[model samples]
Target: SKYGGECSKEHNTCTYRKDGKDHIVKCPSADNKKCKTDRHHCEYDDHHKTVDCDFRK
Candidate 1:
């Protein structure tokens, strides 16, 4: 899940899968110009639920 407005407007269409050990993040907005410019990040909680955003900033 994403935690920003960009994620919602994009319909959470971004897809990613975890290897059950490491966190994997991906952007499905290759065609989406907005998303392409601002990439997403991967965040996981204790339950292993993944999220997306750009944490570099």
Candidate 2:
């Protein structure tokens, strides 16, 4: 079994624009798992011109 559960798939994509700048983030998982699943936690933060886009669970 994938991810300790039934094999499944999930995906997501996010886009953001700030200060005339564009950003994109993507998340992909399997076995019903999410980008921020219990076993996998995603986190992000914005620093200066950098942006955080977490995808998990």
Candidate 3:
């Protein structure tokens, strides 16, 4: 068994940082909608084919 499990497609990780607070989130569809609300999330990279939200720096 994998400790971290398989990360792909419908399952991906995201990091949202602000004010020194890091928000770690598991995006099912890998979308920024769940992370950002008002405007847009800086984490999304044109929305990937399989994973919508990619890992942000």
Candidate 4:
């Protein structure tokens, strides 16, 4: 139920990096969830009916 890490189709877990550390997070199976990678933050958009991801910076 956390908000970070990219969901890989290869696995149920995702690898995330933040604050000079590594995080082991769960992959989102539904649009109600969100995920984060090294470059961007990804989330579901109600209007778009899909995922909306953008750069962190």
lDDT by candidate, in order shown: 0.35, 0.32, 0.36, 0.44
Q: Where in model 1 is the C-alpha error above 4 Å?
A: 1-9, 12-14, 19-37, 48-52
Candidate 2 on 7-55: residue-level lDDT in tens?
Answer: 1124343344444654444533333323333223332234433222233
Prediction 4 TM-score vs. true: 0.35
Quick one: ranking by TM-score, best first?
Answer: 4, 3, 2, 1
Runs of candidate 4 with Cα error greater than 4 angstroms are 1-6, 31-57
lDDT of 3 by residue, 6-51 (tens): 1233334554554556544564443443333322232423235222
lDDT order of candidates, best first?
A: 4, 3, 1, 2
lDDT of 4 at 18: 52
lDDT of 1 by residue, 1-57 (tens): 323322222443333334433333343343332233233532333354544433333
Best by TM-score: 4
Instruction: Itemize residue pairs with steric clashes in candidate 2.
Output: 8-31, 35-56, 35-57, 36-56, 36-57, 37-57
Whose lDDT is higher: candidate 2's or candidate 4's?
4
Tens digits of per-residue lDDT for model 4, 1-57: 223334444444454555566655544555444333333444333355444333343
- Give per-model TM-scores: 0.23, 0.27, 0.31, 0.35
Considering lDDT, which of the candidate structures 2 and 3 is the better prediction for this target?
Answer: 3
Which has the better TM-score: candidate 2, or candidate 3? 3
Per lDDT, the best of the predicted structures is 4
At residue 20, what lDDT does model 2 achieve? 60
Shift of residue 48 alpha carbon in model 1, Å:
7.2
